[PDB]
């Protein structure tokens, strides 16, 4: 049976000690030596994609509607962009018609 509390936040350990095990196939398992309490300090958590990176540091107050994260869309060897009738992010596309 799994304990599934419905509240998002940062996990805090009170009177809790971990125990790392080794097994037959290589299992990394955490055991409690003596049973204690697990606290979660409440807060709304925003899942970012792994291709992104946050801007705000580890302690800074955010204003209303401010920027939280911006990634780097970097593709190389492209100088001028030319598009006709689509979104379609593309290349210089020097094509010819004889």
């Amino acid at each position: 049976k799994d304990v599934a509390g419905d509240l998002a936040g940062e996990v805090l350990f009170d009177r809790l000690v971990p125990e790392e095990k080794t097994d037959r196939q290589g299992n990394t398992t955490r055991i409690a030596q003596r049973g204690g309490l697990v606290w979660i300090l409440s807060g709304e958590v925003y899942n970012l994609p792994p291709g992104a990176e946050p801007v705000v540091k580890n302690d800074e107050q955010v204003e209303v509607g401010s920027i939280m994260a911006e990634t780097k869309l970097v593709t190389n060897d492209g100088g001028v962009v030319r598009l006709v009738s689509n979104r379609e992010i593309e290349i210089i596309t020097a094509s010819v018609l004889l």
């Binding site: 807060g43 955010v62 994260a69 990634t71 970097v74």
Partner: peptide, 23 residues
């Protein structure tokens, strides 16, 4: 645009305000 530079970027919106804990 020069090569080796950024093309575009997006933000991710913050619904509420407050101080950042975490990283």
């Amino acid at each position: 645009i020069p090569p080796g530079a950024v093309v575009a970027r997006t933000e991710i919106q913050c619904k509420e305000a407050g101080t950042v804990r975490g990283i």
